[PDB]
Design a protein around this ligand. Structure first.
Ligand SMILES: [Mg+2]
Lengths: 98, 256, 465
């Protein structure tokens, strides 16, 4: 239903603007598939409402950056788990700390 | 469901089953996902108290101790961090047996693993305070950890110093022994009272207040600790000395 | 968003809590002697709307805005503004159900600023998005002419004259976000390219070594079954209490020495393959196969995501260009008519640059009589003030911003044009709240509200004259 479409649009946009699209809430979002077809951006006449288009583009870039951060951490975890196949002092003196 | 999975896995390791397979699956749980650390510590605790098979905990500490971490792996350090913290909280006696391999991680460049193993030494000394199995079963493994917590007052990132001071402050609560170490903790605290970070300074104020509220000079005079009266007490050694010269040494260390 | 109250605490020339009320929604006019604090009122409004470049607020730092640099007892500088919302058509998004909107910016010494809306805290992007919705952007304004910058609007590069029309159309908030989006996509693209070459160099070689030891592990498990059959038969035959008899009477008469050396030749392969392959490699290869498959699915979805975002911004650029042209024609028509009404027998048009496109920049061209001025450097300060004022009022006639701030736009106009500007703001250009600082009486004598500003005892006061 289009009510669920606009509601998911608004909750995704308000999740985007208060900065909580982390590396885990990324893959369960579909703001890109509402950005592609411009049916939510067109308000009133045929002209694009650029206010919510700008907010949607900011949320879309947030989703994309969090997704590449997620693939960075996933490749780091896989590189660690595969690089474990292969099976000098941090103390400093007290002049540096005072 | 969590205790059911724990009991299934513990029955698989103890009686019949490969400890190596369950060990590698627990290590993959620590590798990929950062929430399964408490589950691993509780499973090893259930092995340590009920089924009394402690070889899996030593094997986990061995294979953790010899582990290399990728430069962009911001997950494995936190999982091993919370795992060592929870295993120091839950099963300290089994964790003491392989701590000389565990503390090898103190030169790893990640801050979180250093704070993990420092808090692990603090919690593992602070729980071995009930008397009749501590001061004779393990005497030098606990002293090397006390000395290690003393040396970690000089780490580069101040969070490791903060964890060292907090571990020392939770050591100083329960005192059935190691009253020699409290004077060295006082000396280290008044040295580190003027560091660069405000966090290590504030926690050193807390450590000094903790060792001042529970100073060991009790059952004589009411413990009001004036330098005049205790200096006259030490001046009375001419009337005392020139079998009870330990009271003179007592008065000297209290004056210091 | 008509301003109703302005509360200034600890700002540049204001040491106390100064509350300015009784703002008329049509025309407010600030007056006073020199050094009184009028441009500091406008600097407080600019500061509560958010500034990056502190040279337009006339400071070299952020602690330079507190009273006597914060070293005179007032260590904080907080500016509060209250907007009325009896007209819901110019209201921002989400704030329709609040009849008053308060915005406050605070700065203490040492640190940086922090914003609050209606008492509750907020970051700077929330208030910047709140004020970028009723086109009150201070970082690229079409409503703010600071002091001494009225004869310099025509000295602007064509990108800025384009940006005024872009802010009137509504697409500047898309343009800066699109440039930020291209920069962020380039940075995440080189990060993802580093991640792809790390996947190509470091993962699949170790993955094929894992597949190699997987097939050697199937061979080792065949030898495992060989041990637990043959060595069990061997230890049963040297053990010889009825089960051993039952497993003797199936293989009666097996030779001892060949079975013993076969057990030894099986155990030597066992002590080799024990240090060759780990016995739990099947769950390990299942785990890393699932991780590699999910990783490649993630990289494909990221690439399709970038393709969708790029095709969507390429589709939105066409509607941006069409609304830019549709805004530019009406704005240059009203520009010519307002300049013809202000200065008689004159005309002015906004033209795209020589050979390039409208979306590359705009230039002002001025006609005085029947001759076209080839360069607008030969015009007076009063004529350039009238062209700049007529451009700002043409942008009002397209889409009126709620607050037009004018810091001494009448310093080069004569005594006729000053009274004509005051009359045309009082009569013609209704629909916006004008905050004008002037010293000529012909402008603030045609005013609906007048605030005097005075310097007393070290601070500044605002009196409703
Ligand atoms: Mg001024």
């Amino acid at each position: 239903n289009r009510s669920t479409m606009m509601a998911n649009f608004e909750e995704w946009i308000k999740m985007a603007t208060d900065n909580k699209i982390n590396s885990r809430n990324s893959w369960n979002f579909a703001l890109i598939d509402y950005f592609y077809d411009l049916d939510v951006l067109k308000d009133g006449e045929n002209n694009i409402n650029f206010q919510k288009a700008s907010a949607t583009l900011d949320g879309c870039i947030k989703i994309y950056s969090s997704r590449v951060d997620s693939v960075t951490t996933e490749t780091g975890k896989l590189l660690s788990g595969l690089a474990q196949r292969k099976t000098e002092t941090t103390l400093v003196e007290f002049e540096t700390i005072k | 469901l969590k205790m059911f999975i724990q009991r299934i896995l513990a029955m698989c390791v103890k009686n019949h089953g490969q400890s190596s397979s369950i060990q590698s699956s627990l290590m993959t749980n620590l590798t990929y996902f950062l929430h399964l650390s408490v589950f691993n510590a509780e499973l090893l605790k259930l092995l340590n108290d009920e089924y009394n098979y402690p070889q899996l905990t030593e094997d986990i500490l061995k294979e953790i101790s010899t582990r290399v971490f990728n430069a962009k792996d911001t997950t494995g350090p936190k999982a091993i961090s919370n795992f060592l913290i929870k295993l120091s909280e839950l099963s300290p006696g089994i964790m003491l047996r392989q701590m000389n391999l565990v503390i090898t991680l103190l030169n790893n460049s990640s801050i979180t693993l250093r704070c993990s193993v420092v808090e692990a030494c603090g919690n593992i000394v602070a729980e071995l305070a009930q008397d009749p199995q501590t001061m004779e079963h393990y005497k030098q493994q606990i002293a090397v950890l006390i000395e290690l917590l003393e040396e970690r007052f000089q780490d580069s990132n101040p969070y490791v110093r903060t964890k060292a001071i907090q571990g020392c402050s939770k050591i100083c609560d329960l005192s059935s022994k190691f009253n020699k170490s409290k004077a060295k903790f006082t000396s280290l605290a008044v040295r580190s009272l003027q560091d660069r970070s405000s966090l290590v300074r504030r926690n050193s104020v807390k450590l000094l207040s903790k060792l001042l509220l529970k100073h060991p000079f009790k059952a004589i005079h009411g413990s009001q600790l004036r330098l005049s009266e205790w200096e006259e007490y030490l001046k009375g050694s001419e009337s005392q000395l020139n079998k009870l010269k330990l009271m003179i040494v007592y008065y000297k260390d209290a004056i210091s | 968003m008509k301003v109703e109250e302005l509360i200034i605490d600890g700002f540049k020339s204001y040491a106390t809590r100064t509350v300015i009320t009784d703002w008329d929604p049509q025309f407010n006019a600030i007056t006073g002697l020199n050094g009184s604090g009028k441009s500091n009122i406008l600097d407080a409004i600019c500061f509560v709307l958010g500034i990056a470049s502190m040279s337009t607020v006339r400071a070299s730092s952020l602690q330079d805005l507190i009273y006597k640099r914060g070293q005179a007892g007032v260590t904080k500088a907080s500016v509060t503004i209250v907007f009325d919302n009896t007209d819901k058509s110019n209201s921002p998004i989400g704030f329709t159900n609040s009849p008053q909107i308060s915005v406050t910016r605070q700065v203490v010494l040492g640190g940086t600023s922090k914003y609050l809306i209606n008492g509750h805290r907020a970051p700077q992007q929330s208030v910047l998005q709140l004020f970028q919705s009723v086109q009150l952007n201070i970082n690229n304004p079409n409503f703010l002419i600071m002091q001494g910058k009225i004869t310099k609007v025509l000295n602007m590069k064509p990108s800025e004259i384009l940006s005024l029309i872009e802010e009137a159309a509504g697409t500047k908030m898309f343009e800066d976000r699109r440039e930020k989006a291209e920069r962020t996509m380039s940075k995440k693209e080189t990060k993802l390219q580093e991640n792809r070459t790390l996947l190509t160099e470091e993962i699949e070689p170790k993955l094929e070594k894992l597949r190699n030891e997987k097939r050697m592990f199937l061979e080792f498990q065949s030898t495992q079954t060989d041990l637990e059959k043959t060595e069990r038969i061997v230890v049963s035959y040297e053990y010889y209490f009825d089960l051993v008899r039952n497993i003797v009477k199936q293989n009666e008469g097996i030779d001892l020495d060949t079975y013993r050396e076969r057990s030894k030749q099986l155990n030597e392969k066992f002590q080799e393959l024990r240090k060759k392959v780990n016995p739990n490699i099947m769950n390990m290869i299942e785990n890393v196969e699932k991780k590699e498959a999910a990783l490649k699915t993630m990289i494909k979805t990221i690439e399709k995501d970038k393709m969708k975002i790029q095709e969507t911004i390429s589709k939105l650029n066409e509607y941006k260009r069409e609304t830019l042209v549709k805004t530019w024609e009406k704005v240059t028509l009203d520009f010519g008519n307002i300049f013809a009404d202000l200065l008689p027998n004159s005309f002015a048009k906004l033209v795209p640059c020589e050979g390039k496109d409208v979306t590359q920049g705009l230039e002002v061209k001025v006609k005085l009589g029947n001759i076209w001025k080839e360069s607008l450097i030969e015009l007076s300060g009063g004529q350039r003030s009238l062209i700049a004022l007529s451009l700002i009022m043409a942008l009002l006639q397209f889409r009126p911003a709620p607050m037009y701030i004018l810091d001494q736009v009448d310093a080069a106009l004569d005594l006729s044009h000053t009274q004509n500007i005051g009359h045309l703001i009082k009569t013609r250009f209704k629909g916006s709240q004008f905050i004008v600082v002037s010293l000529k009486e012909g402008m603030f004598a045609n005013a609906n509200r007048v605030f005097r500003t005075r310097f007393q005892d070290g601070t500044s006061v605002v009196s409703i004259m």
